[PDB]
Amino acid sequence: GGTEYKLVVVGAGGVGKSALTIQLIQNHFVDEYDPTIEDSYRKQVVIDGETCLLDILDTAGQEEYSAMRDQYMRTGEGFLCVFAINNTKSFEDIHHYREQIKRVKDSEDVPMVLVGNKCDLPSRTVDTKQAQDLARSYGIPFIETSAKTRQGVDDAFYTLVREIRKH
Ligand SMILES: Nc1nc2c(ncn2[C@@H]2O[C@H](COP(=O)(O)OP(=O)(O)NP(=O)(O)O)[C@@H](O)[C@H]2O)c(=O)[nH]1
Ligand code: NA
């Protein structure tokens, strides 16, 4: 079959995991999203001239520690770790998501991208420099996004695929 990349989107409640997923897949911004038991979506894209299938797995609605969250992390080949640039707590939580991924994968070297979403909103509390320093510590890219204005959305997911392809 065509090459498929299972990309898992993680982050604190309300950061925009689902809006990012739906913007990528459907090309629409949602004002609200109700997670279900399984929220995954597939779409063909071309990245660096190579066609592939993205299967996006959204962890929205999963509890912080649960069998289904672990199953999603076991299945994922790459991870978007999302915070919101107007919510400091969601940025402080990033280390937690990275630790959970490293635990489930039993590895320090897992394809990941740090995503700072909601860059369109006025009340920024996290600087790009802060996010870049965290990303540098983890050895991963940082991408700023807005699911609303569409800034950076493709870049975040496509960068994650590039990270998977480098391993
Ligand atoms: N202005 C703005 N609002 C956004 C952005 N991304 C998401 N939102 C809004 O933020 C709220 C939460 O988004 P949602 O995608 O449900 O976040 P989530 O991380 O999946 N939440 P949960 O894990 O609680 O289900 C929604 O009202 C959505 O419209 C963005 O980039 N900009
Ligand atoms: Na899109």
Numbering used by the authors: 0 to 166
What does the paper say about this structure?
RAS proteins are binary molecular switches that cycle between active guanosine triphosphate (GTP)-bound and inactive guanosine diphosphate (GDP)-bound states. In the active state, RAS proteins interact with a variety of effector proteins, such as RAF kinase, PI3K, and RalGDS, leading to activation of downstream signaling pathways. The role of magnesium as an essential cofactor for small GTPases is well established as it is required for both high-affinity nucleotide binding and GTP hydrolysis. To examine the effect of N-terminal modification on the tertiary structure of KRAS, we carried out structural studies on KRAS constructs containing iMet (unprocessed N-terminus), lacking the iMet (partially processed N-terminus), and KRAS lacking the iMet and with N-acetylation of the second amino acid (fully processed N-terminus).
Among the two KRAS constructs made, we obtained crystals using KRAS (2–166) that diffracted to a resolution of 1.5 Å. Like the Mg2+-free KRAS-GDP structure, no electron density corresponding to Mg2+ was observed in this structure. Unlike the Mg2+-free KRAS-GDP structure, the switch I region in Mg2+-free KRAS-GMPPNP structure is close to the nucleotide binding pocket. Also, in this structure, we did not see a register shift of amino acids in the β2-β3 strands present in the interswitch region. This is likely due to interactions between the gamma-phosphate and residues present in the β3 strand. Structural comparison of Mg2+-free KRAS (2–166)-GMPPNP with previously solved Mg2+-bound HRAS (1–166)-GMPPNP (the switch I region in active state 2 conformation that is compatible for effector binding) shows that partial closure of switch I and a structural rearrangement at the beginning of the switch II region causes the side chain atoms of Q61 to flip away from the nucleotide binding pocket. In the Mg2+-free KRAS-GMPPNP structure, side chain atoms of A59 point towards the Mg2+ and sterically clash with water molecules coordinated with Mg2+. This clash results in the loss of Mg2+ from this structure. Thus, the structure of Mg2+-free KRAS-GMPPNP provides a probable intermediate snapshot of the SOS-mediated nucleotide exchange process where it likely displaces the Mg2+ using residue A59 before displacing GDP.
